[PDB]
Amino acid sequence: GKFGEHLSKSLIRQYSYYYISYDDLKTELEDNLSKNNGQWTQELETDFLESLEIELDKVYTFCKVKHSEVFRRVKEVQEQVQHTVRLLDSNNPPTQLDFEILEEELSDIIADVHDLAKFSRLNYTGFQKIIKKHDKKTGFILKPVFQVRLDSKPFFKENYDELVVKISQLYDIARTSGRQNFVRQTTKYWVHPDNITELKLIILKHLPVLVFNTNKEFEREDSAITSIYFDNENLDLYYGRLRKDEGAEAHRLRWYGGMSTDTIFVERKTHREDWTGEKSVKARFALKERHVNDFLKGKYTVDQVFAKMRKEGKKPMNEIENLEALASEIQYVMLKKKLRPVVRSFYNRTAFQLPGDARVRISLDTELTMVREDNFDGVDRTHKNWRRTDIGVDWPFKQLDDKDICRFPYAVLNVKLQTQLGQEPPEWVRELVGSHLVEPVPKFSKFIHGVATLLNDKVDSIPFWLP
């Protein structure tokens, strides 16, 4: 058909080969009708049906290949959004640009599912139109044959309705979490174990409990957060953070969940002093567990870290080199100052925050423990690895010796305020910070507490909160 081939040419030109060869099948009918003097035979029917089978196999395999591609792209961004949601509770939450990149990637997948739906509906129409022309130009009827064979087992699978619901769930996270001059106030508090459940019930009535996966049953390992703090034999980074010196750095390797966690966050906290007050510049980057050991040693270069990140090409040119300069800075401080694992900080965090609202952000750290990771006493705990393998997320870790583990008797409540200039925060948080339930501890640190308790013999200067 002329109208059938005219609408066919308005296809996705990027995949023109995998579409139905309508013009080739149209000429095959007319050229075979030119010979044998306008008469079609059973031998001529087998040759045409064999050509349709080559076309069907070509369209079905392409639909099967592109089905696996979109399902893999969603599975990858589902892991990416679960990482960013887990990062909203930390001292450095993801910026508005980080959610814009996830939105751009989700919209790119929406276009891929759209193109795949357009490919299937045009090829189905193409097969129905070539059979309509076959039954018109030739006496043999194929209309009941191909309308039954294509209605059952179609080009576009039924599995996409499940995918549409999941795509919408991840897109809503990027929409809700997204959206000038305001004062920032971060305060830490000690909570008694009797007050933990009482405090959780008060905050959930104003700020909801932040859940990462949602489409999965509640697990014990989900709320767990483990950070491996790095320092040298002289403990130079500890004294710098304790004395609050200019440019004092704090290096840690953090992972969310159990021991099966793939992504390891190389986190750095830098103390900066100015006329406005005290400012803590926090910066980090993602790294696979198999590449961590060689990165700290120097064997795994910065260009090898962002090798898969550069070939993707969906991040800004200025942001890629910012993460590259940050990775080279940490790798240099790791080798120059000769840093190694010193203290491990384990705790189950319950995050409380409204999506797209930074005004009041509260988190409760329960089951807080300090674990020895050093070799200063002549005991190889790490066995030349970035973390201890004898302990994981299995709290209270009863297998460890009393001198290696420090079970904190309280729960740490982190209240982060971001109130606008010339405005007062809500009355409920103002009443909670000054209540009997919490004990205000200014500038408390899990790293400083762990080093000063577990390595008290090696340290000369200790914080005000000890013992």
Swiss-Prot record:
Crosslink site: Glycyl lysine isopeptide (Lys-Gly) (interchain with G-Cter in ubiquitin): 75
Mutant phenotype after disruption: Leads to a decrease in intracellular arginine, consistent with a role for polyP in vacuolar arginine storage.
SPX domain: residues covered: 2-148
Cofactor(s) named in the record: Mn(2+)
Binding site for ATP: 188, 252, 254, 269, 282, 347, 349
GO cellular component: autophagosome membrane; cell cortex; cell periphery; cytoplasmic vesicle; endoplasmic reticulum; endoplasmic reticulum membrane; fungal-type vacuole membrane; vacuolar membrane
Catalytic activity: [phosphate](n) + ATP = [phosphate](n+1) + ADP
Topological domains annotated Cytoplasmic: 2-467
Note in the entry: Present with 8710 molecules/cell in log phase SD medium.
Subunit structure: The VTC core complex is an integral membrane heterooligomer composed of the catalytic subunit VTC4 and the accessory subunits VTC1, VTC2 and VTC3. The complex exists in 2 different sub-complexes: VTC1-VTC2-VCT4 and VCT1-VTC3-VTC4. The VCT1-VTC3-VTC4 subcomplex is mostly found on the vacuolar membrane. The VTC1-VTC2-VCT4 subcomplex is observed in the cell periphery, probably ER and nuclear envelope, but localizes to the vacuole under phosphate starvation. Each subunit contains 3 transmembrane helices. VTC1 is a small membrane protein without hydrophilic domain.
The name this protein goes by in its record: Vacuolar transporter chaperone complex subunit 4
Source organism: Saccharomyces cerevisiae (strain ATCC 204508 / S288c)
Gene name of the encoded protein: VTC4
Residues of the full protein shown: 2 to 479 of 721
